[PDB]
Amino acid sequence: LVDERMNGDGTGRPFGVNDPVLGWVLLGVFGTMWAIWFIGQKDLGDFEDADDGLKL
Amino acid sequence: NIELALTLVSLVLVVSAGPLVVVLLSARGGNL
Amino acid sequence: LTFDEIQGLTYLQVKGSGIANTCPVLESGTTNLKELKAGSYKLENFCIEPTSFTVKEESQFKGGETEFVKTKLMTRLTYTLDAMSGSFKVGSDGSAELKEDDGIDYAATTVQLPGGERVAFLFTIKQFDGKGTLDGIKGDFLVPSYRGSSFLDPKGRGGSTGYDNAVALPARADAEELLKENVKITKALKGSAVFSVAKVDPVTGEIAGVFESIQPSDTDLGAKPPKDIKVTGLWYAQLK
Amino acid sequence: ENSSLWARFCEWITSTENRLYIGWFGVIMIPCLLTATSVFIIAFIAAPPVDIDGIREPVSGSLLYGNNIITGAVIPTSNAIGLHFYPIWEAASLDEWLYNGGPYQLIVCHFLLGVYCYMGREWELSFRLGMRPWIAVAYSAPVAAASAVFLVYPIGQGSFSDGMPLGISGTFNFMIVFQAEHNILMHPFHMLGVAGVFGGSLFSAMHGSLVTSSLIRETTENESANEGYRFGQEEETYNIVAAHGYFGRLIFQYASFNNSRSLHFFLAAWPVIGIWFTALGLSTMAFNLNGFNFNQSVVDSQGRVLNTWADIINRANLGMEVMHERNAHNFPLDLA
Amino acid sequence: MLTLKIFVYTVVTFFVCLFIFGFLSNDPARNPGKN
Amino acid sequence: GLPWYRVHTVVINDPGRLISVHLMHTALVSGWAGSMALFEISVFDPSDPVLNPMWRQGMFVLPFMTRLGITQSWGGWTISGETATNPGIWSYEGVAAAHIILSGALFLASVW
Amino acid sequence: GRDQETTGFAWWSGNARLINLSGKLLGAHVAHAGLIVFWAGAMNLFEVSHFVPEKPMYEQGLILLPHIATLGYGVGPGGEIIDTFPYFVSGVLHLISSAVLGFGGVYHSLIGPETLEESYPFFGYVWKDKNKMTNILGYHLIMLGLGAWLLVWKAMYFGGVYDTWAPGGGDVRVITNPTTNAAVIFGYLVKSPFGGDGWICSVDNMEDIIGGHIWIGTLEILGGIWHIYTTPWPWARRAFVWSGEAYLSYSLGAIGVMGFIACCMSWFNNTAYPSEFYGPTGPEASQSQAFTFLVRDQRLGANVASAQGPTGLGKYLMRSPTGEIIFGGETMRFWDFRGPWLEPLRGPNGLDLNKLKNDIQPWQERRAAEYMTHAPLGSLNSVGGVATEINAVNFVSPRSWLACSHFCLGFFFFIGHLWHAGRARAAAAGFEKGIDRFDEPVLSMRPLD
Amino acid sequence: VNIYGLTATALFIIIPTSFLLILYVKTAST
Amino acid sequence: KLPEAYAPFAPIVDVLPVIPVFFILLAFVWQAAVSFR
Amino acid sequence: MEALVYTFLLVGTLGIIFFSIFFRDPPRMI
Amino acid sequence: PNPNKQVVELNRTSLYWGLLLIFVLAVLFSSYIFN
């Protein structure tokens, strides 16, 4: 046909991914920043006992 | 029109039935 | 995809894919072009899919030649002519007659020039009557006016409905600018198209090929000169 | 040191010592409202004309296409798209995106997602400064009204082409067409919204003048009275008793508010509740609930129609609806 | 166009994961009020 | 205090304000370069390069872009008299924008 | 009763007095749950008494009877109402149960204990006890999970539910094969909310609906058992506020989204909200108009395919932006509409005009002409046209009442989220009464902020 | 009478006139 | 309409939906009776 | 031509917004 | 707290030279500018 499309306007794809690299973008960027948060979780407090939130 | 009149009688017996709780409970007792 | 691969899909699977804008390719069948049996055929599922839109644009420069330039498409996927009914006749030697009567045989389409000029047109083959051998079914269709007669401009002027003058300029309501207020010309022009049958599948009664048409663009109800647009691409039909 | 990379980033994002506070809503608010700001200014100036109505006539809204500040607008998305999601990457060319009203849906998606997070960080800085939270609840009323015009009314009508145009004269078209199709003037929630902005302008002038007319004499007549207040002074620079005891004389004594804290709650609650209703009134007419239709309501004996002022509003209403979107309608009922 | 879509999905998920893990990184303790 | 012709000598003693005040001049020079190239493109007539060329039309900074390779435009036209099929990013308007984007970046650096 | 100076709450915020009063708060909810069941009993019998069989269910202002009709009680093929007595039993069983819920709600509000902590330790709770809060959260998920299995049992075993997509017209269909495929069920959830997707408002058949409630039934039974036997993990201690007003604000933001979802659910969907009972959707009535004049004018000797409109796009049939043959006009925006009267005319490549020139059925033009004159536009005094329409009919669609009420309720409960989540986060921090006036934290900050 | 020279005259007046007025009224108040 | 063994009780049914509007009003009467303490 | 004047008035208004935030007269306490 | 802060001064005799200079240049050159 005349031009080139991505062809996903009304297809209902999961999180709008149609190249599998887009799903690894979703997992890579979430996973990179989950890991930065997880390693940095030692500076956030060890809320280990049961009554250890901001409560009233 | 008895079907319209009973609807008004049913309205008055119910629209009083709330304050009649509040009035009677104010007179005798009063723990409201 | 073939015709049977399209019809083996549900509506929600073909929706939003661009498959619905395409003619069925004729994968089975050979290019021998003679085992097509002579005689008359009423021609249904006749569909035409273009591949290029080039317009005869005058050159930007002063001594430049006027050729057909590559364009990019503004309307999205609304340009395939599809499901046209008509009659198809072939001779004993190879002389063929293509004719369509009803169907979706027009497609309004805006296309943009390299330079920023948006030329709009309706891609049609409507009321086609073409004769000739299976490499060329040369004939002429008509191009109707791109807007109807009851179309109204931004100032409310139009052919059938409308003011017929510039009402917001009450002293110069009718003046020497009556080219675009006093006449809204909706005269239909003519276009020529060349079909060439390329593949025959006689066991199913399916024939396909390549088409080439040239048609006028748009006159803005008689306010700009219409430009010539060369449309090429594929086509497909079902003899049955 | 002991602090990680993420922990020093959290103490910078939530830092109250930034000049503009960021917060965790500001890592959404800033890259959204810089995206929508940059593509607004480029499309208000230089966008090519837009097929708003889906009928393949383009509508110009840009300064470079013969528009001024009043008549220029970022044109809403095409009617052929509807509520479909049309980003840049779903177009073939960038010019097809520009032709079909693509810039509008990119502004509106980032603007709405930016004002939802602007509301979130008005909460957040209040929590970081030790404040009570509900300035965000007050800002939810222009947020809901922005959400009604750009999101909810397109959702109800089925196209972003029915969303409000991003411009001055495009807004006016949006209002005039709305009153023809929904009769917004005869809707009580718009009536309450007008009472919120007429009351909110009355009360801004009322509270603004009683405080100004009760200023303690601190300066001379050679210097403005606004120099009698020092920023950070702990005394209270006007006389609330003299202001109350004046407005008490003016209408009624118990009509006034002797409580300045109760005064400023009512001063907040009259516009915010009024705009809450006209944001919902716009959102109920999004679903075509419409305004009161009292047309041919007064009828005399022998069954004949006496006109009212509502019948004259209808003559002004049905003049607009026979002329709005003048080429779109092939069929006699504007159901879209 | 796909290069733009990959880039926007890296960008948007960068800022969404800043949002989510920011409130998971002990937001309710970032008050001036002591208890 | 100082006379009117001596005001800029507050910068002779501190080098940090000397960065900031050359950055503002550099933002104005490239801010002129993009603005003059936008003005010249908006009035240039690329129709006849043979008998109405750029020096005939008053173009001053357009022969300096064209001297170092920039021959194509985002309006399709070129200088040699043909259509640009791929203008690229380094058009006349791309460079007229690349100097304005640099003008605002140098502006912010001067405020810093 | 209780007063201001012993609580610090005025009369206008006096339900906030019973935050830490577990028994009073229980009677507050059970008496309120009496009202929801009382309204559902009373408004059901109001709609049974005012039901007229000569008129459609959507014409009469009925919003609760289409819910019992969608379950398939008392409906026939094509949405015809067989009997009204199944709608009467649903009204009385709620109206009688409301007195039982009303009794114990009045009981625990007046006579029952103020805090049921020391006498009834199973029901007692402190808001900061994170084990007991998940324990009560787990009990109610099992109730929501077993409630979701009632819809599955009624569709699979107890007579079936109304399928508007059934072959032979819409009637009650036992859903023998509910869709338990996780790629299909969790494909709605990750779908985009925009045009052509509609997040979960496009669920197009009842097999995905009933098979989806198998998933929501099992996950809530499993997620209830999960919260009974666990406490929130330390990352969840770190993120939440653990007060009773916080738990309210968590529920208010969750339920304010659900009001927005059911707003767009009843407006767009016609499978869980069948058009025989709720009337046509916004998209359905606008597509019904273009279909009605495509059959009117085709019988008057006009080719509906070759007919060019005044703009040049096609008056009756045009092409979708993804290439489907759709209806022309301003209803090009609703081209992704699917309806059970329209889908018999639709092939792969959009609508099939060969099928549409020869095989328009007489029942389809009956139903599409009904939907055009019952478009979901009306007025606030229930007039029933565009705003430029005279007082002739008496109609506002239930879809127009269901969407408009639940956007407003969904909007205010988002405001109630912003109120209580701001307050509970600030009241747990200590500064909900105001600035301390001794250590104002702005005064310990560096100026030129 | 051109658009340039009528406003180039006005800018060569007012931009240096007012600049000198900015510096004088600054100075005469000291 | 209702089943015909209950249609004489249809006058009571037309009053039954508005009753939860009276329940929010009863909270204001009860608070007026204790003088809004 | 007038579009050049329009953008200069819009850039000039956004300039004052930039100076009113980042070069405001700072509120001195006490 | 920049130590390099100076003030500009312009007395009225320098105002009268400056205003004269830009009017005499406008008397001179504008005959050529209007051409």
Ligand SMILES: CCCCCCCCCCCCCCCCCC(=O)OC[C@H](CO[C@@H]1O[C@H](CO[C@H]2O[C@H](CO)[C@H](O)[C@H](O)[C@H]2O)[C@H](O)[C@H](O)[C@H]1O)OC(=O)CCCCCCCCCCCCCCCCC
């Ligand atoms: C088309 C597809 C689209 C994409 C899919 C979209 C849907 C995705 C939805 C998935 C579900 C998401 C739910 C995540 C919940 C996270 C909640 C959380 O904050 O979770 C918080 C908890 C915290 O856990 C606890 O964290 C603690 C932190 O300790 C630290 O601090 C302690 C003191 O506090 C001690 O000092 C200790 O020594 C120190 O280590 C302890 O370590 C505990 O052991 C530990 O259990 O995290 C945990 O439980 C585990 C968290 C879950 C696992 C996360 C995996 C992330 C992805 C991995 C894959 C990446 C791929 C990369 C690709 C690269 C190439 C491109």
Ligand code: CLA
């Ligand atoms: C690279 C070039 C350069 C640089 C950095 C300087 C820098 C300086 N000069 Mg020198 N100067 C230069 C070129 C330069 N000059 C040239 C070419 C001349 C000959 C005309 C002079 C003659 C000169 C004198 C006679 C004096 C200075 C002085 C100064 C100092 C203060 C300037 C001031 O306050 O102006 C303030 C200027 C104004 C407030 C307005 C000036 C407006 C005029 C009309 C120009 C209009 C601006 C125009 C838009 C820009 C176009 C310029 C063009 C080159 C592109 C400063 C150290 C003074 C000094 O040393 O102080 C002790 C001093 O007395 N300069």
Ligand code: CLA
């Ligand atoms: C759904 C609405 C609802 C519910 C269930 C409650 C429930 C409650 N409120 Mg709240 N309240 C409400 C709305 C509600 N309120 C509203 C709208 C306001 C603002 C006006 C208030 C303002 C308010 C204040 C200011 C206070 C309460 C308090 C209370 C509690 C004690 C009640 C009491 O002592 O009354 C005694 C009153 C009566 C006995 C009067 C008679 C009312 C009865 C219950 C009506 C029952 C009628 C019904 C038909 C009976 C059916 C019986 C069955 C067998 C069929 C109670 C749990 C108090 C509290 O916090 O306690 C610590 C308190 O101080 N309320």
Ligand code: CLA
């Ligand atoms: C929220 C869900 C909901 C929905 C979608 C509907 C929808 C409908 N109802 Mg039902 N109804 C509801 C709740 C609902 N109702 C409740 C809670 C009750 C009990 C009171 C009833 C009782 C009821 C009866 C008795 C009847 C209906 C009828 C109707 C129909 C027409 C209604 C009409 O004309 O409204 C007109 C529009 C309004 C009244 C606007 C409401 C706006 C409210 C009042 C807020 C106003 C804002 C204001 C400032 C706040 C007030 C407080 C402030 C002063 C402090 C329609 C199908 C009628 C029908 O068709 O029967 C077959 C009918 O006879 N309803």
Ligand code: CLA
């Ligand atoms: C009424 C429902 C309800 C409620 C209120 C809770 C409440 C809670 N659960 Mg429980 N849970 C429930 C139902 C519920 N649960 C059910 C039904 C299941 C079974 C599936 C579980 C299984 C479960 C587990 C296994 C765990 C919890 C945990 C928790 C706690 C923290 C949850 C949290 O912060 O999520 C925050 C959510 C996220 C960070 C996910 C990101 C969300 C974004 C929006 C993306 C979501 C994508 C997803 C596919 C949905 C897409 C559609 C969406 C856009 C609508 C909290 C006490 C945790 C805990 O401490 O329990 C001990 C825990 O580990 N829950």
Ligand code: CLA
């Ligand atoms: C299920 C939801 C829920 C629950 C349990 C609570 C519970 C509570 N709220 Mg919250 N609130 C909610 C939703 C909820 N609220 C929502 C949705 C909003 C936004 C509108 C608010 C806004 C809000 C404020 C602003 C305040 C509370 C307060 C309170 C406390 C006492 C309230 C009281 O005595 O009422 C007394 C009842 C009245 C005075 C009568 C009000 C009736 C109004 C006018 C509506 C009338 C109904 C009308 C038909 C609706 C028209 C709208 C329609 C068009 C949709 C209590 C903890 C107060 C508090 O102490 O904070 C902790 C407080 O100041 N709430």
Ligand SMILES: CCCCCCCCCCCCCCCC(=O)OC[C@H](CO[C@@H]1O[C@H](CS(=O)(=O)O)[C@@H](O)[C@H](O)[C@H]1O)OC(=O)CCCCCCCCCCCCCCC
């Ligand atoms: C490019 C953006 C868009 C352009 C918009 C065009 C219209 C702009 C209208 C607004 C003009 C400014 C209004 C008044 C500002 C003010 O008084 O600031 C007061 C502050 C004083 O603060 C103090 O300044 C002190 C230095 S001093 O005292 O000034 O020497 C410093 O030490 C101290 O820290 C500080 O507190 O000034 C400064 O900080 C720096 C001097 C600002 C000089 C004026 C700039 C004029 C605009 C030129 C921009 C380029 C234009 C050409 C290109 C388009």
Ligand SMILES: CC1=C(/C=C/C(C)=C/C=C/C(C)=C/C=C/C=C(C)/C=C/C=C(C)/C=C/C2=C(C)CCCC2(C)C)C(C)(C)CCC1
């Ligand atoms: C006297 C005279 C002279 C001189 C003149 C001059 C010197 C002029 C100047 C001029 C100039 C010097 C100009 C300039 C301009 C500039 C501009 C115009 C700029 C702009 C910029 C911008 C606009 C930017 C923006 C931005 C930012 C801010 C950031 C980033 C982003 C953006 C891009 C947006 C001479 C000797 C020659 C002779 C004649 C006369």
Ligand code: OEX
């Ligand atoms: O989009 Mn804007 O305005 Ca809601 O009606 Mn139909 O569509 Mn359209 O016309 Mn009328």
Ligand SMILES: [Cl-]
């Ligand atoms: Cl219009």
Ligand SMILES: [Cl-]
């Ligand atoms: Cl139409």
Ligand SMILES: [Fe+2]
């Ligand atoms: Fe005040």
